[PDB]
Design a protein around this ligand. Structure first.
Ligand SMILES: [Zn+2]
Lengths: 172, 87, 95, 299, 146
């Protein structure tokens, strides 16, 4: 018995950033094969007034939720009030918020195409290789020298229109 | 505290031990029979390798601003091989 | 704000670092720690230009902006009296 | 791109052998070896399973030569000396040899290589002799308790074999616990079950306690040298509990009768010992306490 | 030894280094509205059930939104008069944390930071927490098989 609150960590985005992100996700899930298993949840299904949208991306047994926000009270003097994103990794009534970097790395484990264990040796042997990493967004920290070395040699695949990356949403 | 890694071209490199222990292979070679001798890898390689060692020790701990360790395309194949051996 | 160095004399070279606030002397003492020779016999250069012992590293024109772990600046050293500054280039890659 | 395992292995092979044997090896040999194994794995598709099988074979051949050297001795005890002697080297080798085989690991704690050594060793030499090695050890401890002084390394080596040779992942110390520990313990229970009721009748109760505290000192030390410590096991506490049960608890009634008496005679040095011994017995302390309040009632 | 692992990333890691620093926070309200109104809308939004509260670290591009639960938490003004105190147990990148702070009722200026929360970590779960660590740990390059 007292006011209860649920509290979130929210990174801010410039308005156009959301529109780009939204069009990319909707584009790749429905208009291409790549992101289809992802789910996009509109603003009206969502019980919170402040939720601009959500993208539920299953990773194995646990799922990632990317939440976009509306009419928020941070970052602007404008009438629409401006907005943000938050990200969570959810399994069986457990939650953790996740930062944009890790969000992308985590998405990437389960989704887009990369080098296989064969690729690094085959590159050495001249046997050539498939496939190549798309989604540069998937590699963050620093890198194994091997990975980066390979990276000097094989530039990432470069999809159009680009696949969704949350770091790109939160950049600047 | 320091250990020394040698190039075929006869160049000598001195680097901190904890920096070197980045290399798992080097972590093994140091066991038993300091200083260590590399046959297949040239000097322009071991230099660059020491550079990555430091780069890693520095930016792995604190992720705030992390810059693009630079690698030139011709050095790249030789470097990849060298990395595959050491790491 | 640390700066990162390769000290390169003849074939031998040393990977180390110090603060922008360090003085060339301090470094000559460190080099003494590694190669075991006292800080007289050593003469430290930036390019062809000699370094004053009592002057700070940032004041020799080494800044953390200039010297990065990913890409350190080269120093160079000189060793009965003295020998000319000699820095042995790294092997060249084939065509 | 010219060399794959057929050319290379003949260069690698002698070095495995020096390393298996403790024969001296120079730094450039070791480095060259590292280079060789790695080149073999990168360049040959069949290369790594091949390094594995050849490895397995060479390790068996030398373990077998080792066995040859141990099993020759007919005497039950004089065999053990040679076993221990072979073992110190072999075990140090298990730390040394697997390291150049790291790419072999990456290409496919327990290295497949260290695991392989200790396993090959378990099937080839140890399993046949193990009961015998253990028995000789029980005799050795028996000798030390009686004052015959000897080399610690033998007992330790046998125990080490029992700890480090264990096969199953689910319990690491299981077979060690179920044989060496069980036997060392049974040995304790019977040795002190025999000896204990005697010293009491000879030297009297008060002196019995002084003797008992001491035997506890003796045996806790002995467990520390001979018994598995490093892995932070439960063994020592069990040995200790077992002995306390033997030395103190069996006599718990007979001893305690003295307490009130010594409370009246004001013997403190004696009571310290009583409490010290009893303190280990779980319910041991309380009757001394009740005895004491009861004495406080009349002064 | 799951929680000491958790704590250590809270202690040495840069992400937690910046947030544990006792930074200084402001409340963002209807900024368009003048100061007196804002003082009033804020106190109400705390005392009344439904309003989201926004607090920013002033040094960052990052924000904290307390949403009404309807959409161990607290926003409490009873502790000390002329102030409001704030408690936010969270889980960030797999470490359970608690952000604590206070806000000056007049200034709408305040203070806040992260402290490590052992309780949540002792309590939460084994399989799920662990699964997060297992996953956070790996990176995609070279995992797929040929
Ligand atoms: Zn990738």
């Amino acid at each position: 018995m007292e006011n209860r609150w649920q509290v979130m960590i929210v990174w801010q985005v410039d308005r156009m950033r959301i529109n780009t992100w939204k069009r990319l996700v909707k584009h790749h899930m429905y208009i291409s094969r790549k992101a289809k298993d992802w789910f996009y949840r509109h603003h009206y299904e969502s019980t919170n007034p402040k939720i601009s949208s959500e993208v539920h991306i299953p990773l194995g047994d646990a799922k990632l939720v990317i939440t976009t926000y509306w009419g928020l009270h941070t970052g602007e003097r404008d009438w629409h009030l401006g907005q943000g994103v938050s990200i969570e990794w959810r399994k069986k009534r457990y939650s953790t918020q996740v930062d944009p970097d890790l969000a992308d790395q985590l998405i990437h484990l389960h989704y887009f195409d990369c080098f296989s264990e064969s690729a690094i040796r085959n590159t050495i042997l001249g046997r050539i290789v498939s496939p190549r990493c798309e989604y540069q967004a998937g590699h963050n920290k620093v890198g194994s020298l091997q990975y980066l070395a390979l990276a000097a040699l094989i530039k990432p695949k470069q999809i159009k229109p680009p696949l969704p990356s949350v770091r790109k949403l939160t950049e600047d | 505290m320091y250990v020394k890694l040698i190039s075929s071209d006869g160049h000598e490199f001195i680097v901190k031990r904890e920096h070197a222990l980045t290399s798992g292979t080097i972590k093994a070679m140091l066991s038993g029979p300091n200083e260590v001798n590399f046959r297949e890898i040239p000097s322009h390689v071991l230099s660059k390798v020491c550079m990555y060692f430091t780069y890693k020790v520095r930016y792995t701990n604190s992720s705030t601003e992390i810059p693009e360790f630079p690698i030139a395309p011709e050095i790249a194949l030789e470097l990849l091989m060298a990395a595959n051996f050491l790491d | 704000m640390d700066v990162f160095l390769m000290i390169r004399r003849h074939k031998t070279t040393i990977f180390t670092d110090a603060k922008e606030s360090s003085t060339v002397f301090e470094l000559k003492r460190i080099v003494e720690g590694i190669l075991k020779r006292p800080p007289d016999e050593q003469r430290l250069y930036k390019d062809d230009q000699l370094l004053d012992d009592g002057k700070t590293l940032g004041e020799c024109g080494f800044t953390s902006q200039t010297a990065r772990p990913q890409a350190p600046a080269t120093v160079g050293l000189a060793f009965d009296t003295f020998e000319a500054l000699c820095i042995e280039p790294f092997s060249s890659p084939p065509e | 791109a010219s060399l794959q395992f057929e050319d290379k292995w003949d260069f690698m092979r002698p070095i495995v052998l020096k390393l298996l044997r403790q024969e001296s090896v120079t730094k450039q040999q070791w480095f060259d070896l590292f280079s060789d194994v790695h080149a073999v794995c990168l360049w040959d598709d069949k290369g790594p399973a091949k390094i594995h099988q050849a490895l397995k074979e060479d390790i068996l051949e030398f373990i077998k030569q080792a066995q040859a050297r141990v099993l020759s001795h007919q005497d039950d005890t004089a065999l053990l000396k040679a076993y221990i002697v072979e073992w110190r080297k072999f075990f140090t080798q298990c730390d040394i040899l697997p390291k150049p085989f790291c790419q072999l690991e990456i290409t496919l704690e327990d290295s497949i290589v260290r695991k392989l050594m200790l396993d090959t060793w378990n099937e080839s030499i140890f399993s046949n002799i193990k009961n015998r090695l253990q028995d000789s050890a029980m005799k050795l401890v028996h000798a030390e308790r009686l004052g015959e002084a000897f080399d610690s390394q033998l007992v330790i080596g046998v125990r080490e074999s029992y700890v480090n040779l264990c096969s199953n992942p689910e319990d690491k110390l299981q077979i060690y616990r179920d044989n060496f520990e069980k036997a060392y313990l049974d040995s304790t229970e019977r040795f002190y079950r025999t000896q204990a009721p005697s010293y009491l009748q000879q030297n009297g109760v008060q002196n019995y306690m002084k003797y008992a505290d001491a035997k506890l000192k003796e045996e806790e030390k002995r467990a520390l040298r001979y018994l598995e410590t490093r892995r932070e096991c439960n063994s020592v506490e069990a040995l200790m509990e077992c002995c306390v049960n033997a030395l103190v608890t069996s006599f718990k009634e007979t001893i305690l009768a003295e307490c009130q008496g010594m409370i009246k005679r004001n013997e403190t040095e004696k009571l310290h010992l009583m409490f010290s011994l009893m303190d280990k017995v779980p319910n041991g302390i309380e009757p001394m306490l009740k005895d004491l309040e009861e004495h406080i009632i009349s002064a | 030894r799951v929680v000491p692992d958790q704590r250590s990333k809270f202690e040495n890691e840069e992400f937690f280094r910046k947030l544990s620093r006792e930074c200084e926070i402001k409340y963002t309200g209807f900024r368009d509205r003048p100061h007196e109104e804002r003082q009033a809308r804020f106190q109400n939004a705390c005392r009344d059930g439904r309003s989201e509260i926004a607090f920013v670290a002033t040094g960052t591009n990052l924000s904290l939104q307390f949403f009404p639960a309807s959409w161990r938490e607290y926003v409490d003004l009873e502790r000390e008069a002329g102030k409001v105190y704030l408690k936010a147990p969270m889980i960030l990148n797999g470490v359970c944390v608690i952000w604590k702070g206070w806000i000056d009722l007049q200034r709408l200026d305040g203070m806040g930071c992260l402290e490590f929360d052992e309780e949540r970590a002792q309590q939460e779960d084994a399989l799920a927490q662990q699964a997060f660590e297992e996953a956070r740990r790996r990176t995609r390059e070279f995992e797929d098989r040929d």
